[PDB]
């Protein structure tokens, strides 16, 4: 309504051919695996997964190799994946392949999704238990109303690819979902979005259970909920509000930064 | 006893010192993880020679990085910026605008999404005096107890502003926290001491029923450790263990 | 294919560097994740491959955060002393190590060190529930001490410890902290971190409100997926490699191999 | 008991010369405030104070002066300050007075006592807003069992009444407030400081979580006499100073 004018916003970037497009996917990507470490999502173990399209190889996927740390991980660690049999089509090491069915098959049934993003962590984890949407509690948990789903079932680990067919299903064409008894999974439309919806939802958790814990907090109405996620919860406010994100974990590795494309 | 906040013989040398100072302070609040909250987090400085214009950090940069050359100066009335080439947070800049306008004695406003301050303002409550260190708001902060969306007019902003009167803070429900000061480093110490008593509450809610510093006394106890004088002094280590931590950025202090 | 295995070793020198090389960077890692925060009271011990019933321990007082392979002390089961090295280990500590070795010869490495999370939820003497996949591991393969009698200083007391200890991989000290053992350094140093974030997690979830556990069943299998040897000493070696990158100079003592 | 031998934990020093003792004394008191540093217990203002008394010199104690970060603090910035007038006697800055006043009733109460920490924490003043003794809920809580005060009012007069309450214990919980510890040595207050702070941690978090069961009171005061001791306490804290040392090289190269 009142929103900024067309020009506030910084746009992604575009560019003119397919190499251009993956060296920078490959370097967002290795740099969004730096920033989830610092925030202690690399404890893991071999849990976690970031997926990001092939811009040109269709159904194909670059992925984190399976026990590289992400603290270290640099572009040419990343492994590129073949959807339908998640064999290692470049690189050698192989990807989680339970964590890979998921993001396949969430891939598949969301060809608007660039980047698939699963963390193991804490306050996801403890929040996951509940079997819970997120509330709209604050301002900043306004971006996942009536935009995300909990998974209600769970299977053990993801061997068969229709129990990914399955989290897709129930994700339709949200930004997140809760895998109940597990942890969360965010999508975008870019990296970027993805990574600051992951980021965000975390730290949603983590305020929902300190509150809940605390006491007995009173939500956001759904009318005003709604009319702040659609304020705060567009593809355009995720790929902007990722930047600075960015920009701070690039300043932290010298040895990183150097690697960004020119 | 006491040091007292400088004077200066131009506006050139105010001006040096206090964007030196705002980014020193985001460096700060960087470092205590206030810099996650992707484009939400906003100090303005009231220039001390333009009127109603305010040095602001600019939209999306990190606060881990900023320098005073990264600082715009930002119409009050407009939210153009009128010097450097980025542009404020509008939402965030309505909200202090206003109180700057409000607020002739406040030099700075600050507003950052933290998860205390988040967490705690999702109860719509007054922080109570719970320990010593929270007496500081005893009787000087405000709810703001409406929550409508970003704040994109100006209305909200003065409504917001209306609401802070003469105090040193006020809580967005559903929001989050806001704090002013007479200088930058007295607004950064509240906003550092407000997110720490929001932590301290939250546990001790969740740990039990925690008894309350009586009202007398705690007003007693805001008075001796709530005053300007107090806030700026206490800041001071703050802002030398941030220049300590970036041997690059101290050299850039001026005289 | 799949999973990298546990190397094997020609000679017993070659195996003796590498575990102390690799008991050295475990300490290392939990220094980092704050678990050397607790004075005296951390403690891993790994079983010399050659020597019977002797074990290499970190030594009395050397904070974690420092510490090399060379400051790692060799001690007899029996008897607590240093039979290579000049310093004592936690003679308490290794008290109920040097029983759990002894009842469970296919435990290479034992680990006990104080925690946040883990005492906290050692207070409760409550099995860990499989609140989580990740919970899972511990499922029907965990037990509680459910007595607290103060120091170990009786080696009687390290013996009723490893008897309720049985086979599995995890001990819950009541009123004191957790135990975690391995057929490997590498696993021992999984199911001790993966225990203490469980723990975490429980915690934070019971504060929070009623939080469902998964069913038995499915806990059951999901913990044989991701309760293995071979997955808990897969699931180390990102911590192990991430712990070497933060010290390029611990990492040139890395043995060949 | 069953306790370790003569011989088997290491002893405080002693010096032949008061001149070694002080600069011994002083950094150590440098590196102590690292450590609460990279705690964060430096994020207080201008609350946090560590007293450490002149071996020489009676009734006159080293501090970290007011509004120097403890982050930066080297032995030389340390000031010496007389326990009656709390004028600076050594160095040009001035110490908190009002922090200074309860340690200097606390030193004068306690002649046993080398070292006074005073610091705000989050756990430490979480717990200590609901005025009771720190349970013992885990063996590293029982150091405290039986040897803690809770002082049941609100912050000279002040410090001596504080101090009277403290009696012989090594710690005393300023209700509303926050933690102060004591000790025969600057480490061993070092360790009781860190220990309860985590102990106040645990307790919050145990409480929060449900209704955990506590150690019953033989045991605890077993335990607590096993690990509650100055030589134990001492002890605990060497490999945190050591740590502390190894994290900044510069401060180091200060060590006598
Ligand atoms: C057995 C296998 C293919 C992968 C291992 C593995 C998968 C996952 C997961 O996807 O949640 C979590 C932990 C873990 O260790
Ligand atoms: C649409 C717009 C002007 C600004 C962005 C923006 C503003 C705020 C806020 O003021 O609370 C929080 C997050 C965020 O992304
Ligand atoms: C008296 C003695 C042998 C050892 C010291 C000691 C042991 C322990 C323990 O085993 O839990 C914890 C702390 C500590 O200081
Ligand atoms: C007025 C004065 C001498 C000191 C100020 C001061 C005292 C205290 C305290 O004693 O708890 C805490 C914070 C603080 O800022
Ligand atoms: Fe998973
Ligand atoms: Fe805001
Ligand atoms: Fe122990
Ligand atoms: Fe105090």
């Known amino acids: 309504a009142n929103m900024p004018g067309d020009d506030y916003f910084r746009q992604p970037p575009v560019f003119d051919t397919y190499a251009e497009h993956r060296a920078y996917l490959k370097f967002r990507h290795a740099v969004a695996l730096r920033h989830f470490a610092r925030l202690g999502f690399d404890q893991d173990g071999l849990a976690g997964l970031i997926t990001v399209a092939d811009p040109e190889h269709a159904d194909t996927y670059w992925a984190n190799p399976l026990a590289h740390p992400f603290s270290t991980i640099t572009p040419a660690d990343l492994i590129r994946v073949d959807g339908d049999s998640a064999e290692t089509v470049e690189g050698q090491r192989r990807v989680n392949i339970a964590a890979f069915n998921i993001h396949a098959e969430i891939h598949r049934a969301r060809p608007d999704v660039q980047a698939v993003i699963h963390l193991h962590t804490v306050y996801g984890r403890a929040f996951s238990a509940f079997a819970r949407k997120?509330?709209?509690?604050?301002?900043?948990?306004?971006?996942?109303?009536?935009?995300?789903?909990?998974?209600?079932?769970?299977?053990g680990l993801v061997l068969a690819k229709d129990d990914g067919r399955r989290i897709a299903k129930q994700l339709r064409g949200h930004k997140a979902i809760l895998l109940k008894n597990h942890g969360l999974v965010t999508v975008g439309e870019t990296l970027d979005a993805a990574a600051w919806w992951?980021?965000?939802l975390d730290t949603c958790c983590h305020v929902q259970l300190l509150a809940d814990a605390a006491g007995k907090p009173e939500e956001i109405p759904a009318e005003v909920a709604r009319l702040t996620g659609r304020q705060?919860?567009?593809?355009?406010?995720?790929?902007?509000?990722?930047?600075?994100?960015?920009?701070?974990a690039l300043a932290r590795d010298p040895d990183l930064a150097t690697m960004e494309p020119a």
């Open 134 to 155: 997120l509330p709209p509690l604050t301002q900043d948990a306004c971006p996942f109303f009536e935009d995300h789903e909990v998974f209600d079932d769970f299977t």
């Open 232 to 248: 705060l919860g567009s593809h355009l406010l995720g790929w902007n509000s990722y930047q600075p994100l960015h920009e701070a």
């Open 198 to 200: 992951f980021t965000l």
